[PDB]
């Protein structure tokens, strides 16, 4: 089959109350089938529309404030796929089991793929060196049952985020994929996309069509916002990529969609209810690509477009950036760090006084809640007048752009397209990469302009 209908799912999470010690058993499961009743509303949708696969999102039955005791009573002991278990049809095989029953189930009875983020408890002895004081490894788990509620997969989320401190580490990074009669798939959760292991190896080793991305991600402007940086990463890879988030303005907690390699098919961002939301959209099995981008190749052909710059520094997201202003309603700068030169041509379709746009340039080490390599060139919206403030979060704009063009010096072929309109609005159509490293406009844009950003990983020096 050469195409698929594609699901994901943003979830108002009914979260835990806050109390003193562990919940008993029993009141974990209370809670976490509570959230699986308004789980099962999205995926009977979905399947009523003919959709072969449905994403929901990380902690999406249970929530994310835990720590290890606390979290305990939601676990269950979760089997290599490879033992060959439908849930549904053979429970009790391995011991008390109702969250991977009641999902086996799911997917069964309405015939579709079911990717959802549960908890897992692996016990131990002290004739484990590795086995944790308190007996049982705990793990982010991904989970994904077939249209006949078979386990398919498992994977243990590797790159934790500060404050997952409920969870453990996996010895070896788990490169986790399962096939499919509309492609081959490969799986990973949230922060794991700014990382080479299990991320980039999947793709550039193993060769998935699509990816399935449970997430519960806290948007941070100008760079990642969710819908933005998502969408980013499956254009600059080349994959289909379905993305389900968590509902939750309270911590930034919004953007869910479904990316294709040429653009977004469909996204939702909302910081005003609490609705959840669910999206279908038909994807291509196994997606043509274009020619494989040199990042470098036009930027390290041409002169610079301006000199004697006037630059100053701003800070994005705790990083350094050397920044250029840009002084004309049309213009042609160049602006360097170290070894990352980046080019802008422009042309708005106003100028609007109060409002000010810079181009940066970024070339270090990140280090702040997280530790990675990168290289980036970015157009964006300054907060206020101040040149102080270019780099600070900024929500909204006035200005559009008739044409743009931004490229870089990248010493990296993993760079990921980025372009965010006011009202944290994707762009899809309406901009493309050249096979030179060229990212460009194709019209006017819909919308005023956040940011035009090629946000480069440089994962060797991390
Ligand atoms: C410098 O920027 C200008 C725009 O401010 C670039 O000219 C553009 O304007 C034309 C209007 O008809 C477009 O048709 C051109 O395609 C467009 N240029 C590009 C490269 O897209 C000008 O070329 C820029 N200078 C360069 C790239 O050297
Ligand atoms: C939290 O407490 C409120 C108020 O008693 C209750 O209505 C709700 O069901 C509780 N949630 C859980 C998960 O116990
Ligand atoms: C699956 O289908 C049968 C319908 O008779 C029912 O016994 C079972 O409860 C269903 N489970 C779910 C989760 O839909
Ligand atoms: C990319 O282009 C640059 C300069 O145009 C060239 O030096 C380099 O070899 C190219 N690399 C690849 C992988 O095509």
Redesign the pocket.
């Given at each position: 089959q050469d195409t698929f209908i594609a699901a994901v799912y943003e979830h108002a999470a009914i979260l835990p109350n806050a109390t003193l010690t562990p919940v008993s058993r029993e009141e974990a499961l209370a809670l976490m089938n509570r959230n699986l009743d308004i789980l099962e509303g999205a995926i009977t949708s979905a399947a009523d529309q003919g959709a072969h696969i449905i994403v929901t999102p990380e902690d999406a039955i249970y929530g994310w404030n835990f720590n290890r005791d606390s979290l305990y009573p939601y676990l269950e002991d979760i089997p290599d796929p490879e033992v060959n278990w439908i849930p549904c049809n053979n429970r009790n095989r391995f011991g008390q089991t109702p969250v991977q029953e009641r999902l086996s189930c799911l997917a069964k009875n309405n015939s579709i793929y079911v990717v959802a983020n549960i908890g897992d408890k692996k016990p131990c002895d002290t004739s484990d060196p590795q086995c944790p004081p308190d007996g049982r490894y705990q793990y982010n788990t991904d989970v994904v049952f077939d249209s006949q509620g078979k386990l398919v997969a498992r994977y243990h989320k590797q790159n934790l985020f500060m404050g997952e401190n409920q969870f453990n580490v996996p010895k070896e990074p788990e490169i986790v994929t399962f096939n499919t009669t509309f492609g081959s798939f490969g799986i990973f959760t949230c922060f794991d996309i700014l990382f080479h292991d299990p991320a980039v190896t999947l793709v550039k080793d193993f060769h998935v069509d699509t990816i399935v991305f449970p997430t519960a991600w806290m948007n941070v402007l100008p760079h990642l916002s969710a819908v933005e940086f998502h969408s980013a990463w499956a254009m600059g890879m080349r994959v289909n990529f379905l993305a389900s988030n968590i509902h939750y303005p309270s911590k930034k907690m919004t953007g869910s969609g479904i990316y294709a390699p040429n653009s977004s098919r469909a996204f939702h961002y909302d910081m005003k209810t609490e609705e959840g939301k669910l999206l279908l959209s038909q994807l291509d099995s196994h997606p043509s690509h274009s020619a494989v981008v040199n990042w470098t190749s036009y930027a390290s052909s041409?002169e610079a477009?301006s000199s004697g710059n006037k630059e100053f520094k701003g800070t994005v997201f705790f990083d350094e950036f050397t920044f250029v202003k840009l002084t004309?309603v049309?213009?042609?700068y160049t602006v360097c760090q170290k070894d990352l030169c980046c080019?802008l041509?422009?042309?708005m379709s106003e100028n609007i006084p109060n409002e000010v746009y810079a181009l940066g340039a970024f070339d270090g080490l990140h280090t702040v809640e997280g530790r990675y390599y990168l290289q980036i060139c970015t157009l964006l919206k300054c907060k206020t007048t101040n040149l102080n403030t270019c780099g600070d979060s900024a929500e909204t704009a006035s200005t559009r752009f008739?044409?743009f063009?931004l490229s870089g010096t990248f010493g990296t072929q993993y760079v990921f397209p980025e372009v965010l309109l006011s009202e944290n609005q994707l762009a899809p159509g309406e901009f493309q990469v050249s096979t030179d490293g060229?990212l460009?406009?194709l019209k006017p844009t819909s919308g005023p302009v956040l940011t035009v950003t090629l946000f480069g990983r440089l994962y060797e020096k991390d």
């Open positions: 041409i477009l004309g049309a213009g042609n080019h041509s422009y042309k008739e044409m063009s060229r460009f406009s």
